[model samples]
Target chain A: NAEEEVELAKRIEAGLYATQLMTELSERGEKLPAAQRRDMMWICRDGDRAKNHLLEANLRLVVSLAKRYTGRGMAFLDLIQEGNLGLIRAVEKFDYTKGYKFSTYATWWIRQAITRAMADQA
Target chain B: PPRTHWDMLLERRSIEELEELLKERLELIRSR
Candidate 1:
């Protein structure tokens, strides 16, 4: 399990790096030749992939936080699911230029989602 | 028509303005 986890982590990191590269190139397309810029725009439209990649990369964080809330009204699996909803919202809101790590921003959202879910379930 | 979050960001507003927009978007997401 640990080996699999480590491998997954590597993949996630690489995904993040590639996604960021595409994003920057997309933003810089205005400076490129028309042909190149068109290609960049096509890649930019692939932004959804980057978003999903980021969300997948951070799924472990959701599970880790969800662990703390286990046995507190919601099932562990349910908490993770809620955490994931928050994580998606977090991904939707994340501004990579903000100079903060994604996890730091996502932690708040994951906690809020779980807490609200727990409260509503009560 | 509902606006996607990407549309909001693409408006190229200042960071603070974008933060405000994101705040509204987050609230919208939470309200559901």
Candidate 2:
């Protein structure tokens, strides 16, 4: 449902927004002052903590689909690792305004990770 | 497979709990 999905969207976006902010702050070297920069660092830390925990929490979704590819000549464990990389990619690419749940968008990337992993095998 | 069977294999989380969690979390990510 959109309602369920929207919460997922917000947390990811907020986490991502803060995470990106760190990159900007790092690269541009904003010349931010002493106490203010310290506070900004912590804000980024909060977002990173949850953003990563969200990834850890949601790994089950990868397992769910990885089962389908069993006996395709890759271990189920291997499939999960590949699918995982895809999930990370989705986190990087996802934007909620596309009007769909994260899982739907993620399935596309995860599938590619599995298929391509298999394809890469001689 | 029925969409129902296909639908699960994921965790259960609801909007109610999510709403609360999001409120506390987004607050931290802000400039505050």
Candidate 3:
């Protein structure tokens, strides 16, 4: 069973154990002018929670993207499943240290991975 | 409904053999 991220964030906060997350954040802080830097930090520090939040916040991108691949002679659910995998992979490999918002870097990874999988499966 | 009043013809053939024959015919057709 998958775990909820808010609980994971609480765990991360509780796990601070003298390694103040704020200080760690300040040290490796995102210096980007992008507005979502805070979300990215929340993600890096909170691990799984941040990912769940990102996925929830970006369903539009997912649905719009999934629709683009329709009529390629594949099941709609299959494309959705493939797209979800790409989103998770993007969330996993995202680097908050670089100060780039996860969405920018992630969307490219998601689209590319989904497209490759679809072609391979076809 | 392209059915023509039960008009039908049946020929038995091995699936593998048919596949091979199909491949040969496809290649032959492609060469033309």
Candidate 4:
């Protein structure tokens, strides 16, 4: 059982997370038009705490995809690490404006990242 | 088109020269 997902989801749901709180605070400091608005959404809308949790949920998809490559002997952790980076990158690049869930797009990126990492490290 | 006596005389020139000659030939054809 991949316990990391459950643990990460809990951390994400906790709005008081030091890392995200500081991040939201600083992002608000930027003078970009929607910066403060976005930050406020995280704190008030509960989106901030839910983010990393959602990412952890995304880990389940990565692990499931990675399992398909297990015959190659790469440790699940390696795939998970690469997959995490991909998930984060996807989150960073995602256009929430497209009216699609982040996981739908991120699963593809996670699979690609893990596959490439598998090829490179194998 | 068959090479005229003048084109035979202009042989062995660089590509630039050949290009100018071809352009002149095309202009002559267009005029006709």
Interface RMSD of 2: 10.5
- Which candidate has the top score in TM-score? 2
Which one is best on lDDT?
A: 2
lDDT of 4 by residue, B1-32 (tens): 85532233234334454345334433443575
Candidate with better TM-score, 2 vs 4? 2
Fraction of true contacts reproduced, model 4? 0.00
Q: In terms of DockQ, which candidate is strongest?
A: 1
lDDT of 4 by residue, A27-118 (tens): 87854247534443444344344565667667788888778777686887887888888887665455433555666778788888988997
Runs of candidate 4 with Cα error greater than 4 angstroms are: A1-47, B1-32
- Model 3 residue B18 CA deviation (Å) reads 64
Ranked by TM-score, the better of candidates 3 and 4 is 4
Interface RMSD of each: 12.8, 10.5, 32.6, 36.8
Error of 1 at A28 (Å): 25
Ranking by lDDT: 2, 1, 4, 3
Q: If you assessed candidate 2 against the hidden native complex, which CAPRI class would it receive?
A: incorrect
Q: Give per-residue CA lDDT, model 3, range A40-103, as digits (tens).
A: 3443354344446767765566667888888887777877777777776665554333555656
Off by over 4 Å in 2: A1-30, B1-32
Model 4 clash count equals 1
lDDT of 1 by residue, A1-122 (tens): 33433333233333333344456667977355676445434433434455566677889999999999997678999999999999977765655555567788889999999999999988
